[PDB]
Each structure stands twice: as structure tokens, then as C-alpha cells.
Amino acid sequence: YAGNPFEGVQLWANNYYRSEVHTLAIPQITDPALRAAASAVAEVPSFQWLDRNVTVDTLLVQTLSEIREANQAGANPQYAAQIVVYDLPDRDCAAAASNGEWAIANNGVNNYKAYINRIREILISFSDVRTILVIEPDSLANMVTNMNVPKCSGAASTYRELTIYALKQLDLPHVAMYMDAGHAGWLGWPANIQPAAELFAKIYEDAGKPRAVRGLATNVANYNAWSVSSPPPYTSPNPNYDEKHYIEAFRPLLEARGFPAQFIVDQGRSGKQPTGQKEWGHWCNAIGTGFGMRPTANTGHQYVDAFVWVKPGGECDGTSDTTAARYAYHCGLEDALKPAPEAGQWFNEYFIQLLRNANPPF
Numbered sequence: 022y023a024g025n026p027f028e029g030v031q032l033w034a035n036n037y038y039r040s041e042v043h044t045l046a047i048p049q050i051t052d053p054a055l056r057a058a059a060s061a062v063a064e065v066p067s068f069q070w071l072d073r074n075v076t077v078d079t080l081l082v083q084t085l086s087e088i089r090e091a092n093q094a095g096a097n098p099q100y101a102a103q104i105v106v107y108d109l110p111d112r113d114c115a116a117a118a119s120n121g122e123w124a125i126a127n128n129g130v131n132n133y134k135a136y137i138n139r140i141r142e143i144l145i146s147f148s149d150v151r152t153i154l155v156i157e158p159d160s161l162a163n164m165v166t167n168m169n170v171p172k173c174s175g176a177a178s179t180y181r182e183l184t185i186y187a188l189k190q191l192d193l194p195h196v197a198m199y200m201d202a203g204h205a206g207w208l209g210w211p212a213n214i215q216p217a218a219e220l221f222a223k224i225y226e227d228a229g230k231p232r233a234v235r236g237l238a239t240n241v242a243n244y245n246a247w248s249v250s251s252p253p254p255y256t257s258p259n260p261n262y263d264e265k266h267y268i269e270a271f272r273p274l275l276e277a278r279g280f281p282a283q284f285i286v287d288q289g290r291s292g293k294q295p296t297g298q299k300e301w302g303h304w305c306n307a308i309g310t311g312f313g314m315r316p317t318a319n320t321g322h323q324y325v326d327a328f329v330w331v332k333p334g335g336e337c338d339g340t341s342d343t344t345a346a347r348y349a350y351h352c353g354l355e356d357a358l359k360p361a362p363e364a365g366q367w368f369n370e371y372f373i374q375l376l377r378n379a380n381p382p383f
């Protein structure tokens with residue numbers, strides 16, 4: 022399929038994030054400068070996540086409905102949707118306890134198939150709304166590096182099967198799909214990049230190379246630069262120390278195995294470089310980060326369809342409350358901002374950090 026799905030469309034800024042900013046953040050921010058900036062960030066079009074089954078029949082439909090409405094009223098160019106599919110059973114297999122709602126051992130496969138089927142039903146009813154999907158962040162990447170972790174080892178075949186199922190069922194003509202493929206600091210290491218290309222290329226193949234699968238999404242919910250002149254200290258000794266280096270190394274390996282993947286790159290929290298991460302693998306609520314380059318299809322790069330905002334900045338990565346059931350070690354470190362609420366919940370102090378550190382500024 023020849024055609025960048027981000028080209029020739031405007032990207033819809035969804036009302037779920039807008040409401041978060043306007044109802045939870047702006048009333049809380051006294052400083053004029055920041056409050057102007059906040060209102061402006063609310064209009065930056067970030068991905069909306071289907072992180073729970075209940076979102077399918079409510080939020081997904083609401084957003085597609087609003088987009089259709091805006092387009093029917095004369096939006097020019099028309100608006101497109103950006104949605105994340107994020108509800109594999111045994112989700113986030115490397116964590117002690119995931120916020121995911123389903124389990125492989127408790128009818129997780131069937132629940133997920135129905136989930137996908139219902140999404141498909143809805144997408145088919147909104148065939149007039151160009152729809153871009155990011156498929157399952159924090160899933161197949163674990164298969165490259167975390168097979169020594171029992172929940173991951175045990176989830177691998179199901180991850181693969183359900184991913185293929187999704188790629189095939191959501192291969193509709195008005196859709197473009199990007200599978201998550203970690204980031205420079207995860208799969209970009211020379212010991213990992215080849216096995217990663219293998220994995221993803223093979224999935225593409227077994228899925229029948231569906232037209233709709235455009236490629237891969239990188240840096241989702243992470244902080245890496247697209248392109249910086251010198252390597253952040255915590256990146257050494259990796260030559261792929263930013264997404265540009267990663268993707269330039271990654272694409273040829275994918276292509277040689279039959280998957281000429283185009284990429285989208287999350288920059289929603291990449292504005293400040295280097296970050297305040299003490300080590301690169303410090304992924305949770307990292308300090309010293311800022312909103313990054315605004316979403317655009319004009320990337321200047323042949324292999325990159327668009328710079329995007331996948332993880333919506335200000336939505337938490339995980340809780341720092343050691344007394345809490347889904348507490349995660351990484352969220353309690355010295356370079357994680359604290360105290361932090363549950364994953365996905367609004368973390369206003371983190372929002373303010375991102376606003377202060379925005380590059381380009383608001």
C-alpha cells in the first residue's frame with residue numbers, strides 16, 4: 022500500500038484529553054503563562070487509548086462520532102482519528118501486577134477476540150473516518166528481551182496469535198495500523214535489533230501482509246529524542262541512541278525479511294534532552310522531561326510517516342505508592358516524580374513539568 026495515512030488530513034484532538042486538561046489541570050494552575058500553555062496543549066492531537074473494554078462502546082464511538090460531525094460540517098482537510106488498541110490478556114507481562122483487566126487463564130483470548138470484533142464492527146460503521154491505530158504497546162517487544170520472565174514466556178504465543186488476529190480483523194480500507202516496536206533503548210541495541218526484526222517481519226508475513234499494516238510505532242510512552250547531535254550519557258554504549266539511528270538501522274533488517282515498515286515516532290515527552298533519567302531503562306514518570314515536537318506528517322524522513330503524540334503527557338505511567346497493589350519498582354526511584362497515582366490517571370504535577378520543559382515552548 023502506497024500512501025502515508027497522515028498525509029492530507031488534520032489530526033483530531035480528542036475531548037477525553039481536552040477535558041482532562043480543562044477540568045483537572047487548568048483550574049489547578051495559578052500562573053498565567055502556564056495556563057495559556059495548558060489550554061494550547063489541550064488542542065495538540067494525541068492518541069486516544071482503548072485501555073479498557075468499556076471504552077469501546079463509549080469513548081471510541083464518541084470520538085468517531087465527533088470526528089464525522091466535524092468533517093460533515095466542513096473541516097478542511099478532514100480530521101482523522103488516532104486510536105491505541107491496548108487490552109491483551111496478561112497485559113504488560115514483565116510487571117509484577119498489570120493494570121490489564123483480562124487473563125489468559127480466565128478466558129482472556131475469547132474476551133480479546135470479542136474486543137477486537139466489536140472494534141471492527143464500530144470501525145466498519147465509521148468507514149468515512151480515516152482511522153490510524155497503534156496496536157498493543159508494551160507487548161511483542163517483551164518477547165525480544167524478557168523471555169526469562171515466566172509471565173512473558175508464558176504469554177508469548179498468545180501475544181502473537183492475538184496480534185495476528187487484530188492485524189487481520191482490523192485490516193479495513195480506511196484503516197492504517199502500526200505495531201508497537203519498543204524504542205531505541207529497548208530493541209535498538211545491536212544484540213536485540215535483529216531478533217526484533219525477525220519477530221516483527223514474521224508476524225507481518227503470518228498475518229498475510231495485510232494492506233492496512235503500514236509499519237511500526239516507536240518510543241511509545243518513552244522519552245527518546247528523534248535526533249540529537251550527541252548521545253545522552255545514559256545511552257552509552259548504544260550507537261542507536263535516538264529514534265532516528267534506531268529506525269535507520271531497523272528498517273533494512275525488516276525489509277530484507279519482507280516487511281518494508283514505515284514508522285511513527287512518539288515525541289510527546291521528548292522535548293527536553295537529555296532527560297533526567299539516571300539510567301535509560303528508567304521508564305516511569307521520568308523527571309526532567311518536556312512536551313516535544315508537535316505531531317506532523319512533515320518529518321523530512323523517507324521511513325517516517327509522522328511524528329506523533331501517542332502517550333498523552335500528564336497521564337501517569339504507574340503509581341509510586343509502595344503500599345499499593347500495582348506498585349512498580351521503577352515508579353519508586355529517585356528519578357521518578359512522586360507521589361504518583363495509578364497508571365493512566367491524571368498526574369498534574371507531571372503535566373506541569375512537561376509544560377515547563379516544552380520544546381518548542383507553548
Ligand SMILES: CO[C@@H]1O[C@H](CO)[C@@H](O[C@@H]2O[C@H](CO)[C@@H](S[C@@H]3O[C@H](CO)[C@@H](O[C@@H]4O[C@H](CO)[C@@H](O)[C@H](O)[C@H]4O)[C@H](O)[C@H]3O)[C@H](O)[C@H]2O)[C@H](O)[C@H]1O
Nearest residue numbers: 070072158159206207242243301302304333336338364365
Ligand atoms: C531493555 O530496555 C528496557 O526494557 C524494559 C522492559 O524490560 C522497558 O520497560 C518497559 O518500558 C515501557 C516504556 O517504554 C513501559 S510502557 C508503560 O505502560 C503503558 C503502555 O505504554 C502506559 O500506561 C498507560 O497509558 C495509557 C495512556 O496514558 C493509559 O490509557 C493506560 O491506562 C495506562 O495503563 C505507561 O505510561 C507506560 O509507561 C513498561 O511499563 C516497561 O516495562 C524499557 O523501556 C527499556 O528501556
Ligand SMILES: *[C@@H]1O[C@H](CO)[C@@H](O)[C@H](O)[C@H]1NC(C)=O
Nearest residue numbers: 074075077078132135136139
Ligand atoms: C466487552 O464490552 C462489550 C460491550 O462492548 C460487552 O458486551 C462485553 O461483555 C465486554 N466483555 C467482557 C468480558 O465483559
Ligand code: NA
Nearest residue numbers: 086087090091
Ligand atoms: Na458533537
Ligand code: NA
Nearest residue numbers: 215216217219
Ligand atoms: Na531470533
